[PDB]
Amino acid sequence: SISVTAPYCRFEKTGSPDLEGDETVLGLIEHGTGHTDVSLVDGAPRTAVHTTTRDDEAFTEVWHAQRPVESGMDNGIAWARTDAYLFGVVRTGESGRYADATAALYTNVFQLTRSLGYPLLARTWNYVSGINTTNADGLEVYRDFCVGRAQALDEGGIDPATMPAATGIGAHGGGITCVFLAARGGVRINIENPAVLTAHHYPTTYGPRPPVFARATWLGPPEGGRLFISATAGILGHRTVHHGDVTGQCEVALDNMARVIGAENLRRHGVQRGHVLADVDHLKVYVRRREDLDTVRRVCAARLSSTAAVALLHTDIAREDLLVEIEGMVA
Numbered sequence: 111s112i113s114v115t116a117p118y119c120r121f122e123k124t125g126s127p128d129l130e131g132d133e134t135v136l137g138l139i140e141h142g143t144g145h146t147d148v149s150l151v152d153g154a155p156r157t158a159v160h161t162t163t164r165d166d167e168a169f170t171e172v173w174h175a176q177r178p179v180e181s182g183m184d185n186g187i188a189w190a191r192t193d194a195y196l197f198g199v200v201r202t203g204e205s206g207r208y209a210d211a212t213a214a215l216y217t218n219v220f221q222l223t224r225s226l227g228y229p230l231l232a233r234t235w236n237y238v239s240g241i242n243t244t245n246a247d248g249l250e251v252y253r254d255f256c257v258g259r260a261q262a263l264d265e266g267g268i269d270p271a272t273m274p275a276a277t278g279i280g281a282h283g284g285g286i287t288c289v290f291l292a293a294r295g296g297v298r299i300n301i302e303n304p305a306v307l308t309a310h311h312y313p314t315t316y317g318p319r320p321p322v323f324a325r326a327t328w329l330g331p332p333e334g335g336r337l338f339i340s341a342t343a344g345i346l347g348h349r350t351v352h353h354g355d356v357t358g359q360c361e362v363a364l365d366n367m368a369r370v371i372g373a374e375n376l377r378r379h380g381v382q383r384g385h386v387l388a389d390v391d392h393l394k395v396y397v398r399r400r401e402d403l404d405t406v407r408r409v410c411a412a413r414l415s416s417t418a419a420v421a422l423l424h425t426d427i428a429r430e431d432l433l434v435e436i437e438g439m440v441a
């Protein structure tokens with residue numbers, strides 16, 4: 111009856127003119143060599159995150175759905191909504207300590223989704239400055255971030271199984287930035303990977319509080335819906351594999367992505383049609399070492415579609431021994 115479009119992505123050149131005047135823009139994330147505050151630009155939430163080290167790798171990640179009906183800012187979160195979907199962005203400053211601030215940020219996200227009427231989270235991203243550095247309290251920043259996220263779920267009475275696809279990736283400055291998509295209602299199916307341990311079941315080696323996220327999320331009606339794939343690493347079970355071997359890690363990351371979106375895994379989660387890697391688009395490929403970026407580019411180019419939008423970003427991964435990760439979606 112009512113015309114509805116589920117969220118989708120475009121990659122654009124930062125600083126390039128809006129040639130087409132596309133009313134469907136929800137919000138914008140500028141990947142590059144610095145950061146900014148979060149604000150609304152003509153109704154569209156925007157911020158810049160410091161996710162690479164060369165300006166010639168900068169680009170804008172633009173989320174779309176249909177003409178937004180309302181935008182605002184609450185508790186540091188800039189948001190835009192259509193009647194069916196919500197996009198938000200929020201950040202907390204560079205600091206010696208992050209758990210308490212992260213718990214507050216996620217509390218504010220959960221509260222906004224409840225208050226506005228978009229309770230089904232569909233996708234989250236966390237751009238974590240100094241993700242492998244040690245904080246002022248002597249704890250790795252990623253672990254400090256995980257404590258805060260986990261605390262917010264308890265503060266909100268949130269079932270960890272409801273957390274959707276995610277990314278937890280480094281930045282080179284700018285504290286912690288969280289981006290999210292949420293839905294008014296409808297279909298939101300969180301998907302696991304049969305050879306990868308569920309994140310919030312990770313053993314305490316990775317603690318003191320485990321990560322929490324799904325390996326992919328299906329959002330929306332069977333026709334028109336989207337498959338959002340988490341940032342995906344070279345892990346089997348919970349374990350990092352191919353230590354020191356970025357090619358092997360990249361191959362396993364791509365294998366994990368293919369497994370998550372494959373026909374039989376999707377069927378087992380109630381999703382009716384399967385996919386292959388050539389179907390994935392709007393991929394971001396995070397690479398720890400500058401000297402590995404071309405190596406990784408070539409591995410990916412041998413498996414991804416030649417028409418897929420692919421952006422490589424030079425930045426750290428949630429574990430020091432992870433060298434590469436890939437996220438993307440099927441529209």
Ligand SMILES: O=C(O)CCc1cccc(C(=O)O)c1
Binds near residue numbers: 236
């Ligand atoms: O555990 C992993 O599989 C690799 C790291 C990873 C991937 C996706 C999301 C996160 C997060 O903490 O939000 C972390």
